[PDB]
């Protein structure tokens, strides 16, 4: 068990894998014409895990064409058989390829074994199995004779144009979700994986092919983000963006798409299905179990270096409980594989993130309205290591309470106990994916639950804030037959 | 019945109604400051039915403010009570105001009594009653203790920003749907009705108030379409557009919104919920019952002068059956608020009339077109354009794809053996609806499948004229954990 | 695990806990004005577990007032939040307070660890979790437009008056049921716990408060049973009795309530929801598996000293099987912690019960129509210990076949095999909560199952006789809106 | 139709029917031993419709014995067959006996044909048909092997003791419901009908027998209410009271039963299933549609002379609308088996008549009361009391709470700004039903909530006149275990 994992880690650690494009079922390597991106280990950046072939404009056009050419045979493949491919992929990843997938995700994305397992084995398999179940329900349509005598059927067709999947580094499972949800519903996909998840994502591609995915149904085109995206969006048959990642990248994609829409580039109005996370909050009420709120906040903020769409990054503490909360938290942090380094829970994904977080820490040192209460340690000599960091803001509207850092950085504001209601109001005034209240008093919980209803899509009571899409990839078509002759 | 309808007609005919803005429950008249739009009878355009107050930039700002100020008390009003308002409005329109609403729709929108009844009484009432039923299902969510022991509830909240409803002239019921769907779900609404349905739409507004709609939940702001829209879209709390109307207007609205989005003026990404219709088709297979296909096509194309999002406007006939089909059709057409000899009813306004005249006159000068029937028009009394059938010699001629929004049918005749080819041509080349007439199941199946992307509603042996609530809410999950670390 | 239990037992065993009233969220101690009841260990009665403050007339009036004052804010607290309190209480008792609750129930109510666990952990938590589920179903009402055009909603309101919960010593879980069922449905409660379960019941109260129960929603008023009851029943707003306990106490409560009703003391007709148990039976058919029936009868009669509402206390044996049954049973009994003593399975709850059972045994020795076949041992030198006792009655209508003893005393009647049908008839002629038949022959089972349908609410085939209420605490209110104007 | 009804009326009018007891399926007449009650026509009290045999103490004992003796064969009769009897009775009453039942109810209970039809035909048939449907659902229980491997069934048994049904004069349908609900569930019944509905109730009994009701399952024992009740309640097997009628009679029955319980005469705790009605209210908000509220209040208060458990008898009017409401109401009242000029129909008997006369005459002498309309009465021919409206100057005046069971409305006028206060007064101070008339949703919501304990059925813009099977059974669970220790 541990030996099989060790063996997988050693395989990937001992040489660099050549990661090709996969277009129309065919593996395309650099062949001395295409650029090569070195994917390195975030915990040990001297180690090159893979040399990733980079798609040219021509490659992208070919990927788009492959998707169009595969479309008809794909949506005419019965749902039972389309599903079997994805269930088979889930089983292959859970068994045959379990240790390879774990190792690729650990090494490439900088996760420990438990983080890797929850992501690239469990959650990944869950997406596929659950989508098959939901889809089976959606497709269970029987024709009906209406009261007026007409004979009616409804059918869910895929989108007419192709789907562009743009996936993030942070979860191997999310890449699976982004490509699998549209494909299952009879769509075909051009897929640009994150450069820094290429190893695990390529594995996922090869597993799908082994599971029987037909050529061209999904096309794997890593490359320069701007270059690949501009060429995908140039095609008149672009049907949908399926995206998970940062706000700023989404905004860029959005504006590029709308630009094409208004100037008539597209046959249809493209659908945009994006998730970006936000500045998620933990709100502590004076009645909270402090120990539980502390531990929940540590896990919510610092687990996987805060690199989750749902990660907590701002904390509101009542004044009468601040010292106890903070001293408890600092004590626990102070008392605390693909690679690791003492004083750090794990690495961040790349040098760009590392450099951004360094700026965040160094800027805080020079801001009189900020105070670093704990941490701020960083070291890039071996890997991209940034330590857990806690920064107190003097006012609740300081930029640090709203700027997303995508790292292990917590900004805390302390409010006077009697102004609990006002603090909820402030949160409601000023967008988050998730939020949590820690409290025992039900009237306060009810107040916040109601007041913050527009401030988070998922609200948690006494739990960390880290814890239907199929219908976005189809359109209904009704057929109605009349038997009466005028 | 007829005496009561006659009375309502004679009432609106006698003089002109001053139609005010309705903002935060207050009626705002022109007050010697605002412009007016004279809404006239399209069957008798000398007759001014209403003088419609036109919203200023400041009125629009006040409407937007009213919607914002009414929002919390509206979404906190229990669903039972929000529904009651709309059920009551449907009943008032179906009973107390039935004849006034029929008269307003007949006179203002150029409908005969049967067309008016199906629209402003029946379909309108149905929208409200069915939405209430659908919403009650949506709101039926009970909390559950999951496997892991957490305690979960899900609730649907309204959009945080306001909804801009922009409604068309053609159905009073569509205006009801455009304002009613978002409002029922706890949203508030700024509503610009079509100038040429102002009388019936204003009656709808006043009925909603009588039914108990709270002030500012819906705000009635007719006005210069460009000025009103620009001012509504300038507000940072714009949450959604709910629109039914022409493709060109939708594209203009779409562009104006996306411009604001990318430029950062909106607190949220606005939702765009639009319906534009298209160039809807009837396809006739050689095995069709011809008489039925003829009658279905007449009804689908010419009812209400073709002014329906789903109206048929292109026809594909097989060569072997075309003479019989067309002679039948022409014989039937020949056999056939106000009216004029030779016409079924008027089109809505002079701008439509003039566009249709150009379409007809252009067809007389195009070698690839021939007017086979009709093409008559007269604007001396009302906007009257007669049923018109134009044969195109080429299946991709512009008349086979340009929307004319009028009683004009373009027909292409295909050789019988090329039925599969003509289906392929329809697929290869933007329709809300389409229909095939045929007895042969193999042909029906081929077309049903080939044309699966060519129309959202597909009809077999029927004219092509024949979940939205979820677009106006978003889910929010609450999860409570009991375990202490 | 065993060490954590040991530690809890030692805590409660080493000093006497002062148990206060809890009224409107406030703990009220004796303060040199109120009487104090010593709750002692039934297995070791020299050990004082708690000194229980006793409610005065004034205290009771204040408890009633607290319940009225808390009512509106309680029933307006959304069901989701009311439920969360009870689910949280169940989880706290299953985890944080598991060993304290176990120890309090073992020590105070004279249960071994397994008996305690089934009761105060498992069954208690089950009541709360299951009531939340059932309640969630009851409240899931959607409005509907009827055929006539009217618009209808139905809602379940709590009772208008308060609920008086009177709970027994025998199960900590039953106290939880008695207070929790009405409270969950939006009622408020004045609660008089059994004197001899004060320790465990007080713990349950403190856990509910920790779980977020609002002040005054439940009020904990131990005191003299007659004094407290008379004062509760004096209030015009008395809405319901929720009771589990002996027949004679219920009858007293019933008559006191009806007295007030007929003389107009009450604003409403009070609801009476009581459970009293009865003289439960095991019936053995000649075709029974004798060994299984013997073992089932031992568990059914003697487990927890017969102190269960559902305990077996009368046994009917066919003559041809009597010797084998009885000799088997006597052999098993002869061959056989908060405290214990050899020859005894555990203590009875108090001296009054002990003295009653002594009379039952000593009276049997002098009754020529009775014969003690086994046991009758008793010892009060250390705890209230009464041994398993089996008494043969000469006729099936002897008082011992119908008098409830609430103790480890089994009365047996032997019927001639051919009179099986007649014996069922006799049982049907002469009220039990539970009954069981032991038999293999289906015709006999069918006959008894049918014949005894009025003789027990729960009937068991080849199993010991030891093994919707939410709607009693609400009333439906319909609202109907009409849109047509005359 | 009218000729058939005329014939049934002329039949019962011609002479007097001897109405016997029905005990164990046998008709028992007075036989020169028993007393008689002459049931007369309340519209024409000289006319004796029936001479009703009155049960002796021994007859009552025999009825109780009959119910006990029929019990086992009744509850063992399959539910399919028990139901068939009641479905058949409903059909016989709806067809074969429709005119005789209409005539008996019209003549005996003082109803016009429309009132009689809704009661003794429609509602009566509905009770039986809906109870059968509800019971079939209840009895739909299949056995299940649980998780632990035990094998379980649940069954509903009837009450072990008999049911005493005590039914009122006012609806023939209520008598059907009171005997039918327990009997359908396998119970047997001793039934004392109201003296003043003996004719229609006896017809119901005879139809049930024709429909196949077995002897002794229901026993028909009219008689001295005190003597019969005392003797029924003396029996140790008394299992339940099923009662609809006045508050005072219910309290007397309640006391007599509890006395027996505490004293130990009953084998079981008897179930008491009672309905008494109360002082039902109409509350008018200033935003109400006045015409509709007026017409609803006239119907709610005065239909069948106010002799309904749910009849409106108190009215709260806002000061600003009171003149308009009341003048409308009085104008409408003014515009309006037997009958008499100025009256809508008779009250049931002389005792009611005399009580109502005292109410009216007392109002003329109370400084805080004023008869605004009506107060006319005449007993020379029938028991005729006209619609009467009395204004009270104090909202807690006794006339705002005493049940009069007659065509008397008490009205309190409140200052418009004190609407919330008047709701609070209604809540602070025993009603089956209540109604609010209003357009304003905020006011409706406030009242709907404040008055949640003040009425079991609450109506919005409708008159206040507009699970019981489970009270007549108890669940018994059987569980089989297969594991051997």
XYZ file of C-alpha atoms in Angstrom, chain A residues 3-478:
476
model
C 5.040 0.696 -0.945
C 2.909 1.046 -4.075
C 2.604 4.773 -3.500
C 6.349 5.014 -2.916
C 6.962 3.213 -6.213
C 4.721 5.622 -8.121
C 6.411 8.667 -6.589
C 9.848 7.311 -7.467
C 8.857 6.672 -11.094
C 7.743 10.278 -11.693
C 10.574 11.692 -9.559
C 13.363 9.939 -11.470
C 12.758 11.236 -15.001
C 10.757 13.951 -16.800
C 7.660 12.723 -18.624
C 7.068 14.117 -22.116
C 3.463 15.387 -22.057
C 1.946 15.654 -25.555
C -1.108 17.379 -26.908
C -3.914 14.901 -27.514
C -5.907 15.870 -30.578
C -8.388 13.547 -32.290
C -7.003 10.628 -30.292
C -3.441 11.308 -31.451
C -0.502 12.237 -29.203
C 1.389 15.240 -30.601
C 4.852 15.971 -29.174
C 7.003 19.088 -29.622
C 8.928 17.521 -32.540
C 11.398 20.436 -32.560
C 8.716 22.918 -33.677
C 6.601 23.548 -30.558
C 7.602 25.204 -27.279
C 8.058 23.042 -24.171
C 6.923 24.068 -20.698
C 8.779 22.460 -17.784
C 6.314 21.484 -15.058
C 8.321 21.390 -11.839
C 7.618 20.122 -8.303
C 6.339 23.071 -6.186
C 7.950 21.467 -3.116
C 11.248 20.985 -4.965
C 11.396 23.205 -8.026
C 14.705 21.840 -9.321
C 12.810 18.649 -10.102
C 11.268 18.659 -13.578
C 8.244 16.344 -13.530
C 7.249 16.884 -17.133
C 8.083 18.731 -20.319
C 4.734 19.844 -21.667
C 4.205 20.297 -25.388
C 2.634 23.690 -26.166
C -0.197 24.024 -28.707
C 0.263 26.279 -31.750
C -2.507 28.223 -33.498
C -2.603 25.404 -36.026
C -2.898 22.774 -33.291
C -5.845 24.629 -31.775
C -7.692 24.853 -35.094
C -7.118 21.115 -35.512
C -8.433 20.471 -31.997
C -11.558 22.509 -32.750
C -12.060 20.644 -36.033
C -11.607 17.306 -34.266
C -14.349 18.264 -31.819
C -16.765 19.211 -34.624
C -15.968 16.022 -36.582
C -16.537 13.831 -33.496
C -19.768 15.551 -32.459
C -22.434 13.668 -34.408
C -21.091 10.183 -33.648
C -20.722 11.221 -30.005
C -24.219 12.522 -29.290
C -25.664 9.579 -31.214
C -23.745 7.199 -28.991
C -26.455 6.071 -26.531
C -26.310 7.628 -23.059
C -25.789 4.156 -21.523
C -22.510 3.840 -23.443
C -21.352 7.463 -22.940
C -21.857 6.941 -19.183
C -19.975 3.646 -19.178
C -16.833 5.451 -20.337
C -16.939 7.819 -17.359
C -17.830 5.185 -14.780
C -15.001 3.038 -16.183
C -12.605 5.988 -15.927
C -13.616 6.507 -12.285
C -13.019 2.817 -11.498
C -9.664 2.751 -13.327
C -8.502 5.776 -11.338
C -9.749 4.252 -8.075
C -7.945 0.972 -8.729
C -5.525 0.297 -11.579
C -4.147 3.853 -11.665
C -4.703 4.869 -8.045
C -1.054 5.265 -7.059
C 0.037 6.855 -10.347
C -2.796 9.410 -10.065
C -2.008 10.096 -6.401
C 1.687 10.543 -7.176
C 1.063 12.835 -10.156
C -1.220 15.091 -8.096
C 1.039 15.107 -5.030
C 4.163 15.867 -7.055
C 2.709 18.314 -9.566
C 0.197 20.247 -7.498
C 2.065 20.160 -4.175
C -0.409 18.075 -2.142
C 0.239 15.574 0.636
C -1.279 12.096 0.265
C -4.515 12.826 2.137
C -5.181 16.012 0.138
C -4.396 14.133 -3.067
C -6.692 11.207 -2.210
C -9.690 13.394 -1.348
C -9.220 15.251 -4.625
C -7.976 13.030 -7.436
C -9.455 9.755 -6.264
C -12.577 10.396 -4.173
C -14.003 13.702 -5.476
C -13.052 12.916 -9.074
C -14.802 9.531 -8.959
C -17.772 11.155 -7.208
C -18.241 13.764 -9.985
C -18.409 11.031 -12.649
C -20.680 8.661 -10.701
C -23.010 11.441 -9.566
C -23.256 13.111 -12.968
C -24.213 9.757 -14.512
C -26.990 9.444 -11.908
C -28.298 13.006 -12.431
C -28.064 12.678 -16.201
C -29.958 9.387 -16.140
C -32.756 11.221 -14.314
C -32.741 14.092 -16.833
C -32.970 11.730 -19.797
C -35.806 9.699 -18.276
C -38.522 11.318 -20.385
C -41.620 9.470 -21.534
C -43.929 10.787 -24.239
C -47.420 11.811 -23.128
C -50.801 12.288 -24.772
C -52.089 15.657 -23.558
C -55.681 16.573 -22.702
C -56.247 18.093 -26.166
C -55.257 14.846 -27.884
C -51.751 15.902 -28.948
C -48.816 13.530 -28.580
C -45.742 15.088 -27.009
C -42.106 14.248 -26.362
C -39.291 16.324 -24.922
C -35.632 15.727 -25.634
C -32.431 17.275 -24.335
C -30.030 18.068 -27.139
C -26.399 19.054 -26.533
C -25.235 22.555 -27.355
C -24.738 22.972 -31.084
C -21.288 24.511 -30.768
C -18.256 23.065 -28.967
C -17.314 23.534 -25.306
C -14.031 25.161 -24.264
C -12.943 23.825 -20.873
C -10.383 25.933 -18.970
C -9.323 24.139 -15.794
C -7.310 25.299 -12.733
C -4.283 23.718 -11.026
C -5.841 23.273 -7.663
C -7.937 20.123 -7.983
C -7.476 17.263 -10.394
C -11.183 16.518 -9.753
C -12.213 19.931 -11.069
C -10.563 19.304 -14.421
C -12.581 16.055 -14.547
C -15.792 17.952 -13.724
C -15.139 20.649 -16.315
C -14.647 18.212 -19.193
C -16.950 15.428 -18.004
C -20.168 17.339 -17.348
C -20.430 18.704 -20.912
C -19.117 15.521 -22.594
C -21.603 13.285 -20.763
C -24.494 15.334 -22.167
C -23.315 14.733 -25.735
C -21.056 17.753 -26.160
C -17.511 17.728 -27.509
C -14.738 19.658 -25.849
C -11.480 21.485 -26.446
C -9.620 21.466 -23.135
C -6.758 23.676 -21.994
C -5.407 22.332 -18.692
C -3.469 24.441 -16.196
C 0.269 24.326 -16.997
C 0.956 23.343 -13.383
C -1.386 20.337 -13.313
C -0.239 18.928 -16.652
C 1.049 15.621 -15.271
C -2.116 14.648 -13.417
C -4.377 16.084 -16.119
C -2.601 14.187 -18.883
C -3.024 11.002 -16.848
C -6.748 11.714 -16.625
C -6.814 12.114 -20.427
C -5.007 8.789 -20.993
C -7.372 7.020 -18.555
C -10.432 8.357 -20.427
C -8.928 7.037 -23.665
C -8.322 3.643 -22.045
C -11.936 3.710 -20.778
C -13.064 3.982 -24.392
C -13.488 7.723 -25.021
C -13.855 8.152 -28.802
C -11.255 10.221 -30.661
C -11.873 13.967 -30.789
C -14.599 13.971 -28.135
C -12.195 15.633 -25.736
C -9.047 17.333 -26.949
C -6.115 18.054 -24.644
C -4.372 21.265 -25.684
C -1.979 22.701 -23.100
C -0.256 25.872 -24.307
C 0.270 29.577 -23.680
C -2.995 30.715 -22.034
C -3.480 33.854 -24.137
C -2.417 32.270 -27.444
C -4.598 29.165 -27.074
C -7.617 31.110 -25.762
C -7.539 33.731 -28.540
C -7.540 31.009 -31.206
C -10.322 28.945 -29.593
C -12.480 32.072 -29.323
C -11.888 32.879 -33.007
C -14.045 29.968 -34.190
C -17.650 30.680 -35.202
C -18.796 27.397 -33.623
C -17.691 28.289 -30.054
C -20.675 27.186 -27.957
C -19.667 27.506 -24.307
C -16.926 28.324 -21.807
C -16.668 25.990 -18.823
C -14.258 27.637 -16.393
C -12.988 27.461 -12.845
C -10.196 29.781 -11.730
C -9.346 33.319 -10.658
C -11.611 36.337 -10.987
C -9.155 38.222 -13.158
C -8.735 35.407 -15.674
C -12.522 34.962 -15.837
C -13.038 38.665 -16.477
C -10.542 38.525 -19.346
C -12.269 35.491 -20.883
C -15.680 37.108 -20.404
C -14.708 40.343 -22.163
C -13.092 38.455 -25.032
C -16.237 36.390 -25.527
C -18.658 39.341 -25.374
C -16.464 41.233 -27.791
C -16.949 38.438 -30.318
C -20.673 38.197 -29.563
C -21.462 41.855 -30.187
C -19.398 41.895 -33.383
C -21.115 38.761 -34.674
C -18.302 36.209 -34.654
C -20.510 33.426 -33.298
C -23.277 31.295 -34.796
C -25.016 31.214 -31.401
C -24.937 33.092 -28.104
C -22.197 31.254 -26.230
C -22.974 30.041 -22.725
C -20.556 31.038 -19.985
C -20.350 28.728 -16.998
C -17.743 30.010 -14.562
C -16.803 29.679 -10.888
C -14.234 32.052 -9.368
C -14.397 31.825 -5.588
C -13.988 35.049 -3.655
C -12.998 36.517 -0.295
C -14.649 34.007 2.007
C -15.357 34.885 5.661
C -15.472 33.435 9.149
C -17.577 35.490 11.572
C -17.131 34.764 15.283
C -19.932 35.663 17.718
C -19.009 36.219 21.414
C -21.029 33.109 22.337
C -18.949 30.806 20.093
C -17.036 27.768 21.265
C -13.678 29.490 20.801
C -11.505 26.366 20.547
C -13.694 24.913 17.803
C -13.772 28.208 15.911
C -9.978 28.453 16.117
C -9.405 24.960 14.757
C -12.032 25.441 12.034
C -10.395 28.720 11.023
C -6.935 27.107 10.800
C -8.246 24.336 8.538
C -10.421 26.727 6.533
C -7.650 29.256 5.908
C -4.424 27.276 5.739
C -5.261 23.816 4.402
C -3.627 23.400 0.984
C -2.085 26.851 1.510
C -5.494 28.504 1.085
C -5.530 27.467 -2.577
C -9.242 26.636 -2.611
C -12.063 28.625 -4.176
C -13.860 28.257 -0.831
C -10.892 29.039 1.458
C -11.475 31.382 4.397
C -9.351 34.530 4.141
C -11.034 37.147 6.340
C -11.987 36.755 9.998
C -14.188 38.907 12.231
C -13.524 38.552 15.980
C -15.350 40.111 18.936
C -13.014 42.221 21.089
C -13.736 40.337 24.315
C -12.607 37.070 22.719
C -9.768 38.256 20.464
C -6.808 37.554 22.740
C -8.045 34.082 23.681
C -8.851 33.179 20.051
C -5.587 34.526 18.652
C -3.270 33.152 21.345
C -4.919 29.729 20.972
C -4.451 29.885 17.206
C -0.834 31.067 17.384
C -0.004 28.310 19.872
C -1.395 25.633 17.566
C 0.406 26.986 14.495
C 3.753 27.353 16.298
C 3.577 23.744 17.519
C 3.323 22.483 13.917
C 5.559 13.144 0.381
C 6.301 15.049 -2.821
C 8.399 17.372 -0.638
C 8.205 19.591 2.465
C 10.038 22.107 4.699
C 9.845 22.902 8.436
C 7.480 25.730 9.407
C 5.383 25.234 6.271
C 2.282 23.078 5.719
C 3.084 22.676 2.017
C 4.125 24.791 -0.983
C 2.146 27.200 -3.128
C 1.799 26.239 -6.781
C 4.405 28.406 -8.572
C 6.912 31.246 -8.423
C 4.354 33.805 -9.599
C 2.059 33.003 -6.663
C 5.085 32.955 -4.334
C 6.211 36.393 -5.519
C 2.652 37.762 -5.197
C 2.392 36.529 -1.603
C 5.815 37.948 -0.746
C 4.562 41.338 -1.919
C 1.428 40.916 0.227
C 3.575 40.199 3.290
C 6.178 42.906 2.627
C 3.499 45.505 1.819
C 1.813 44.688 5.132
C 5.035 45.422 7.027
C 5.002 48.981 5.678
C 1.264 49.658 6.109
C 0.485 51.542 9.351
C -3.151 50.372 9.084
C -1.980 46.747 9.105
C -0.129 44.649 11.656
C 1.313 41.174 11.164
C 0.319 39.240 14.279
C 1.855 35.923 13.264
C 4.037 34.369 10.618
C 4.875 35.896 7.263
C 7.756 33.436 6.797
C 8.787 32.508 3.247
C 11.571 30.588 1.495
C 12.065 29.827 -2.202
C 15.506 28.195 -1.945
C 13.942 24.726 -2.349
C 10.246 25.107 -3.096
C 7.579 27.796 -3.121
C 7.116 27.889 0.635
C 5.012 30.578 2.336
C 4.052 30.099 5.979
C 0.686 30.631 7.704
C 0.291 34.397 8.136
C -2.183 36.411 10.227
C -2.595 40.149 9.641
C -4.736 42.515 11.708
C -6.479 45.350 9.858
C -7.381 48.566 11.675
C -10.542 49.112 9.642
C -12.934 46.541 8.155
C -12.800 48.186 4.723
C -9.017 47.990 4.284
C -8.125 46.446 0.869
C -6.706 43.368 2.657
C -10.268 42.494 3.731
C -11.340 42.232 0.079
C -8.313 41.459 -2.118
C -7.977 37.742 -2.949
C -4.449 36.518 -2.208
C -4.857 32.797 -3.061
C -2.450 31.832 -0.271
C -2.119 31.044 3.451
C -2.891 34.616 4.529
C -5.631 35.521 6.984
C -6.780 39.105 7.535
C -8.543 39.709 10.845
C -10.745 42.574 12.005
C -11.801 42.945 15.626
C -15.228 44.472 16.287
C -16.604 45.584 19.670
C -18.959 42.884 21.013
C -22.034 45.127 21.097
C -21.668 45.860 17.385
C -22.288 42.297 16.153
C -25.340 43.399 14.203
C -23.419 46.292 12.635
C -20.600 43.958 11.602
C -23.090 41.704 9.757
C -24.462 44.845 8.064
C -20.966 45.820 6.906
C -20.444 42.366 5.369
C -23.817 42.663 3.614
C -23.057 46.176 2.270
C -19.721 45.489 0.609
C -18.870 39.014 -2.999
C -18.017 35.613 -1.499
C -18.547 31.994 -2.476
C -18.706 30.861 1.154
C -19.087 32.204 4.672
C -19.483 30.886 8.201
C -20.749 32.015 11.584
C -19.445 30.570 14.850
C -21.962 31.037 17.668
C -24.183 29.264 20.178
C -26.885 31.947 20.549
C -29.733 31.102 18.121
C -31.028 34.674 17.809
C -27.596 35.827 16.632
C -27.274 32.854 14.264
C -30.743 33.555 12.854
C -29.909 37.243 12.436
C -26.652 36.565 10.587
C -28.136 33.704 8.544
C -30.799 36.112 7.253
C -28.690 39.306 7.035
C -25.896 37.567 5.105
C -28.196 35.740 2.661
C -26.789 37.749 -0.269
C -23.198 37.619 0.966
C -22.433 33.958 0.233
C -23.905 31.140 -1.820
C -23.027 28.612 0.856
C -23.398 29.588 4.499
C -22.037 27.473 7.346
C -22.993 27.439 11.008
C -20.189 26.278 13.320
C -18.220 24.733 10.467
C -15.330 25.936 8.296
C -16.436 27.711 5.121
C -14.614 25.113 3.000
C -17.275 22.620 4.125
C -27.913 20.963 -11.914
C -24.841 22.087 -13.853
C -25.660 19.367 -16.415
C -28.689 21.325 -17.544
C -26.411 24.203 -18.590
C -24.952 21.961 -21.307
C -28.228 20.967 -22.929
C -31.277 22.667 -24.413
C -34.783 21.236 -24.405
C -36.526 20.481 -27.659
C -40.252 19.715 -27.657
